[PDB]
Write a protein that binds this ligand. Structure first.
Ligand code: FES
Lengths: 123, 127, 107
């Protein structure tokens, strides 16, 4: 059960923290990214999910940084969709962490988490 | 980018039905959030009329609930407002807008239509 | 039904200085308070949601504070197109209700 201090994370920055040996991605999204995420049509997604189905507070993107293809850790702020790129076999994820191109069949998984003031508790 | 284009009769006679269409491009109605209708009275007092979800569920303001009917057409990607038995009361500029919903921050109307000004006049107008 | 009261009602200012509008509701709303900007030309935009969160495109000079039943909307400088009518709604329960409005004029 990991506790992350959200107050420590700057504006448009990515933070990676360990939880059960798996990397947890946390991005403090910018207003523009939040719009980019919630303005995508389901027809363009192989794994249809709204940004709201994936985040509780639009400011905090919290997901397991495990590529759904074969398990590599996607690289932040890379790719053709403004999100993450998996160097292993070329999977591109958007700003909501959804699969947009590549062999990966699913969006980055969202672990269970609850907020508590300036800190979130992943687990 | 999402765009909302409004169209319809900019003038109806009292006792009749006002019908406004809200065309959406760049995002499907069935894809997600909430699709609302609101009106702006000349006395500058915005009023929430109601909505239709991506599923097709309605939610109307109790003030007008018994008169209006907000339907949609997935094929053409546009939702409509139908306010029955209008009165000089219903004279306002109507707006259609999308509202997102996040379990923490709640609702928020992020995409607004151009705004269609309707007048409930007894006058004659060329259809 | 809840109702907001936007005060000051249609107050003007100079060509570049701070201004504080408010919104008090009859009942208690958590922080579910949004703010809209209605341009003179009829174009309405979202400016602030959840009492303090900025929307995409709105300049940094816009703030947003308050809680319980009292709220705010501060500005750094009206330079040069901050002239419009500002509204405010709540969404803790249906139906949503807006404020009386607040016109912003330049002397
Ligand atoms: S593991 Fe990421 S693309 Fe194969």
């Amino acid at each position: 059960k990991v506790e992350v201090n959200l107050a420590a994370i700057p504006l448009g920055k990515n933070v990676v923290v360990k939880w059960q040996g798996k990397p947890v991605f946390i991005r403090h999204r910018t207003p523009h990214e939040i719009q980019e995420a919630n303005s995508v049509d389901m027809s363009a997604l192989k794994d249809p999910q709204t940004d709201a189905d994936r985040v509780k507070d639009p400011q905090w993107l919290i997901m397991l940084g495990i590529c759904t293809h074969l398990g590599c850790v996607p690289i932040g702020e890379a790719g053709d969709f403004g999100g993450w790129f998996c160097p292993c076999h070329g999977s591109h994820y958007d700003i909501s962490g959804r699969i947009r191109k590549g062999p990966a069949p699913l969006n980055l998984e969202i672990p269970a988490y609850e907020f508590d003031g300036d800190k979130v508790i992943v687990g | 980018e999402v765009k909302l284009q409004e169209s319809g009769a900019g003038l109806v006679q009292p006792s009749q039905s006002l019908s406004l269409t809200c065309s959406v491009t760049g995002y499907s109605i069935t894809s997600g959030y909430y699709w609302n209708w609101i009106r702006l009275f000349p006395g500058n007092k915005l009023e929430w009329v109601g909505y239709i979800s991506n599923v097709g569920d309605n939610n109307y303001n109790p003030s007008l609930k018994d008169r209006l009917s907000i339907t949609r057409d997935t094929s053409k990607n546009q939702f409509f407002l139908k306010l029955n038995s209008v009165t000089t009361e219903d004279t306002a500029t109507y707006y259609c807008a999308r509202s997102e919903y996040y379990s923490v921050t709640g609702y928020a109307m992020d995409y607004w239509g151009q705004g269609t000004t309707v007048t409930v006049s007894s006058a004659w107008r060329h259809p | 039904d809840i109702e907001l009261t936007q005060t000051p009602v249609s107050l003007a200012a100079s060509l570049g200085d701070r201004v504080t509008i408010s919104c008090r509701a009859s009942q208690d709303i958590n922080n579910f308070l949004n703010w809209y900007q209605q341009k003179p030309d009829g174009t309405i935009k979202l400016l602030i949601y959840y009492t303090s969160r900025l929307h995409a495109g709105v300049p940094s000079r816009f703030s947003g504070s308050g809680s319980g039943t009292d709220y705010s909307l501060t500005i750094s400088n009206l330079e040069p197109e901050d002239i419009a009518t500002y509204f405010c709604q709540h969404h803790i329960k249906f139906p949503w209700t807006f404020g009386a409005g607040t016109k912003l004029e330049i002397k």
